[PDB]
Amino acid sequence: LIAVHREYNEMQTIIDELCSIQYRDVLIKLPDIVNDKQSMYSMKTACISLSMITAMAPDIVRTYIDRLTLEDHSMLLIKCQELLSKRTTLSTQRCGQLHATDIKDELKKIKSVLTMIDQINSLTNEKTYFVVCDVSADNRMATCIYKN
Amino acid sequence: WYTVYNINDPWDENGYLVTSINKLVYLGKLFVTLNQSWSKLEKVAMSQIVTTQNHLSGHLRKNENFNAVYSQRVLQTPLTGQRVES
């Protein structure tokens, strides 16, 4: 998604911040991504699903952000307020806030939003090959009960 | 000369449902009000015409000229509100 945005040295300024990650006190990084079009198909379907989440998102949900900001208050919540304050590139406010028993349509829309989220997760999610049960004290050999 | 008011569209407590129900109540009341007012005025006009026919006829009854008795018969023709235009 970012290397579509064709730049010079901004690709580097993104990559050197991005690639070195830390999980369980371990630094790993993956170099030399020539950014072929094979990732572009796997990214096009994420783009499709974000468009559909937008169009089929109900009236309860975008309201739920502002309503919980008015009801509760937290620093953690603020972080999400900071994202919604940092980007306001949609600004299309809805009209009605009555919710006058549209509840089957609401169920249908929320099922659709969850299913599009499942599609993006089915992109980003890789298949579990093994399930650990018993680990040696060396953390060198471990037993699993599952083979693809 | 009657005018249907309107339901203010931006504000409403519930939506399509309660504005339809309020419209149905207001329109049923307007319908029965206009029909009762019309029937009231038509019954008034017919009562006054049938009242004045008798006071006209009793005063025209006495004389015996042909123009007199022809005026008596023309003005003693019976009337309904559906016969009044002719």
UniProtKB/Swiss-Prot annotation, chain A:
GO molecular function: structural molecule activity
Protein's cellular compartments: Virion; Host nucleus
Oxidoreductase listed as a keyword: no
Main subcellular location of this protein, as a coarse class: virion
Keywords of this entry: Capsid protein, Host nucleus, Virion
TM regions (residue ranges): none
Assembly, per entry: Interacts with TRX1 and major capisd protein/MCP.
General function of this protein: Structural component of the T=16 icosahedral capsid. The capsid is composed of pentamers and hexamers of major capsid protein/MCP, which are linked together by heterotrimers called triplexes. These triplexes are formed by a single molecule of triplex protein 1/TRX1 and two copies of triplex protein 2/TRX2. Additionally, TRX1 is required for efficient transport of TRX2 to the nucleus, which is the site of capsid assembly.
Protein name: Triplex capsid protein 2
Organism, as annotated: Human herpesvirus 6B (strain Z29)
Full-sequence range covered: 149 to 296 of 296
From Swiss-Prot, chain B:
Membrane spanning residue stretches: none
Compartment list: Virion tegument
PTM characteristics: Phosphorylated at multiple sites.
Family per similarity comment: Belongs to the herpesviridae large structural phosphoprotein family.
Subunit structure: Homotetramer. Interacts with the major capsid protein. 180 tegument protein pU11 tetramers bind to the virion capsid.
Protein name, as recorded: Large structural phosphoprotein
Annotated source species: Human herpesvirus 6B (strain Z29)
Lineage: Viruses, Duplodnaviria, Heunggongvirae, Peploviricota, Herviviricetes
Parent-record interval covered: 173 to 258 of 858
